[PDB]
Amino acid sequence: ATSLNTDDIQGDILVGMHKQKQLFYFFAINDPATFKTFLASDIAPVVASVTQLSNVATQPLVALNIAFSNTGLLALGVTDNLGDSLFANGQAKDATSFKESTSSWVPQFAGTGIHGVIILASDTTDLIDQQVASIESTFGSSISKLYSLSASIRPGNEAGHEMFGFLDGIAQPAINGFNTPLPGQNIVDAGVIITGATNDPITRPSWAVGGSFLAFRQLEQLVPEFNKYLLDNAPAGSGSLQARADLLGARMVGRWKSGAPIDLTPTADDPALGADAQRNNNFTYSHAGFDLGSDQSHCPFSAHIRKTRPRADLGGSLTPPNLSAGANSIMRSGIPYGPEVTSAESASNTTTQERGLAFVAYQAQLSQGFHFLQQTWADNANFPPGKTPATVGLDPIIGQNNGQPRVVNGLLPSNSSASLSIPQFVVSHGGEYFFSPPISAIGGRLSA
Numbered sequence: 001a002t003s004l005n006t007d008d009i010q011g012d013i014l015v016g017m018h019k020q021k022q023l024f025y026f027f028a029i030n031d032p033a034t035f036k037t038f039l040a041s042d043i044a045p046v047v048a049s050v051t052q053l054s055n056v057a058t059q060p061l062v063a064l065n066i067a068f069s070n071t072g073l074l075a076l077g078v079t080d081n082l083g084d085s086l087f088a089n090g091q092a093k094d095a096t097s098f099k100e101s102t103s104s105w106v107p108q109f110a111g112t113g114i115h116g117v118i119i120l121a122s123d124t125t126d127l128i129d130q131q132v133a134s135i136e137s138t139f140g141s142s143i144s145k146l147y148s149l150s151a152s153i154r155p156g157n158e159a160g161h162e163m164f165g166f167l168d169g170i171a172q173p174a175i176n177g178f179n180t181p182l183p184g185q186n187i188v189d190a191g192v193i194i195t196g197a198t199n200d201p202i203t204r205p206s207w208a209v210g211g212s213f214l215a216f217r218q219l220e221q222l223v224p225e226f227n228k229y230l231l232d233n234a235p236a237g238s239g240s241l242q243a244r245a246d247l248l249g250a251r252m253v254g255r256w257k258s259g260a261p262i263d264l265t266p267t268a269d270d271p272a273l274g275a276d277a278q279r280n281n282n283f284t285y286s287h288a289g290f291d292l293g294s295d296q297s298h299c300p301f302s303a304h305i306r307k308t309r310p311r312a313d314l315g316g317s318l319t320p321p322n323l324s325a326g327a328n329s330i331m332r333s334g335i336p337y338g339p340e341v342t343s344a345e346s347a348s349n350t351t352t353q354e355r356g357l358a359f360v361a362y363q364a365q366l367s368q369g370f371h372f373l374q375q376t377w378a379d380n381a382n383f384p385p386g387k388t389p390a391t392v393g394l395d396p397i398i399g400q401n402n403g404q405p406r407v408v409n410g411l412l413p414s415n416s417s418a419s420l421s422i423p424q425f426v427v428s429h430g431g432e433y434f435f436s437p438p439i440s441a442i443g444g445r446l447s448a
């Protein structure tokens with residue numbers, strides 16, 4: 001029965017940092033003894049909890065979370081089995097089953113040299129900067145910075161949008177009964193996200209109960225190229241070029257840039273819908289009487305959000321809310337990075353400055369969350385199953401095919417069998433798998 005201790009869970013996992021800027025600070029541990037000393041004295045009491053972060057009046061000036069790799073845990077003398085072999089083997093090893101070469105990876109990600117990540121969030125970079133100083137002064141050479149990624153909410157009216165322009169963070173699983181569910185939102189057991197929580201089938205070490213597996217990915221987005229492809233391949237029609245291009249963009253994502261799901265508004269954006277959390281997730285893909293297996297006029301089968309949360313595609317209720325595939329939910333805590341598109345990139349339709357998403361997913365089993373979604377669903381041209389045509393193609397957004405163009409069907413409303421071959425517009429530079437421990441562990445077992 002008994003519910004989540006939110007005083008002991010790190011905030012990013014369930015609520016997110018709530019800050020304009022974030023820094024991911026990837027480190028190695030040089031001397032364990034010293035390191036544990038400050039881990040306990042200086043990190044642990046300032047680590048931000050879910051309880052802390054969901055009180056308007058209790059937000060720290062700088063929000064800090066911390067998570068450790070397998071090689072990080074080992075370095076701290078912590079040889080316990082966390083019960084995740086994807087976690088133990090590391091993301092570099094997992095790269096092939098993603099149909100991606102580590103040739104474009106951050107060199108520091110393409111191994112197991114990284115022992116952890118500190119996440120710092122704040123509403124300005126100055127505060128982040130000074131907090132880094134203060135951490136580096138305290139820890140001294142008991143730690144090395146191996147790599148860093150700065151990120152922020154996008155500027156102006158683009159706030160809450162990702163670099164392609166699309167409102168993100170509409171959709172997350174509701175944890176029963178932490179969250180009171182919205183219309184259409186999936187509801188899952190806590191133990192889908194929190195290791196050792198309600199109905200996590202996997203044995204954990206006791207110190208790790210209340211943590212989560214953080215899957216990090218630095219995903220470069222080629223925004224000019226994406227926009228040009230949309231203009232170049234927009235379906236014919238009586239609509240303006242710009243409307244038809246936007247239509248193709250939305251059909252790839254499954255939502256208009258305003259966030260309005262195309263399933264409910266298949267022919268034009270509806271920003272009032274997009275802004276309304278009571279409506280903007282309230283759908284299953286079913287419609288009377290179109291049949292689920294062949295109708296792509298509301299939303300392609302290949303659309304990103306359909307590919308990553310299949311809803312009524314994997315059975316269950318046709319009226320919301322659909323609760324299929326609960327065990328395959330991830331909490332998403334990602335945030336854009338890099339500069340806005342510049343005038344010169346827009347003009348040449350060519351990227352020169354690296355920008356994209358610092359993609360963060362939480363889950364209790366890596367094998368059921370990020371990794372599953374990416375390989376079994378996104379990368380699988382027969383997914384969802386039992387469609388006609390059977391060849392859905394790949395996720396136009398994250399689908400991978402060894403750096404070759406992805407074939408994706410369903411996108412063009414006038415002919416669902418019509419294929420487009422789509423260059424990659426998202427380019428993984430790698431990341432790593434971390435374990436974000438309960439806060440008690442941090443000054444407890446890990447520092448002890």
Ligand code: HEM
Binds near residue numbers: 162170
């Ligand atoms: C640069 C790459 C990415 C971009 C631009 C992107 C963009 C978006 C957007 C615009 C949405 C709609 C917002 C929402 O429904 O809340 C979304 C939803 C979602 N994405 Fe991504 N995404 C990226 C990578 C990923 C990856 C790698 C995965 C996991 C393998 C993932 C899984 C999800 C899930 C689970 C949803 C919610 C679907 C739902 O609950 O209906 N995405 N994404």
Ligand SMILES: *[C@@H]1O[C@H](CO)[C@@H](O[C@@H]2O[C@H](CO)[C@@H](O[C@@H]3O[C@H](CO)[C@@H](O)[C@H](O)[C@@H]3O)[C@H](O)[C@H]2NC(C)=O)[C@H](O)[C@H]1NC(C)=O
Binds near residue numbers: 278319320
């Ligand atoms: C979430 O979407 C569902 C549909 O999947 C909405 O349920 C539907 O809502 C309409 C109202 O627009 C229901 O019909 C209307 O409500 C009364 C109910 O007594 C009905 O008698 C009238 O015919 C009226 O048109 C419709 O029956 C209902 N469908 C189902 C399957 O329940 C729901 O309203 C949406 N939630 C939100 C917050 O928008």
Ligand SMILES: *[C@@H]1O[C@H](CO)[C@@H](O)[C@H](O)[C@H]1NC(C)=O
Binds near residue numbers: 232349
């Ligand atoms: C960029 O793409 C647009 C639309 O296809 C085209 O009009 C324009 O000429 C391209 N820019 C350059 C520099 O080629």
Ligand SMILES: *[C@@H]1O[C@H](CO)[C@@H](O)[C@H](O)[C@H]1NC(C)=O
Binds near residue numbers: 415416417418
């Ligand atoms: C639909 O696309 C398929 C595959 O390209 C093609 O063979 C068929 O001729 C198309 N039908 C129409 C009406 O374009």
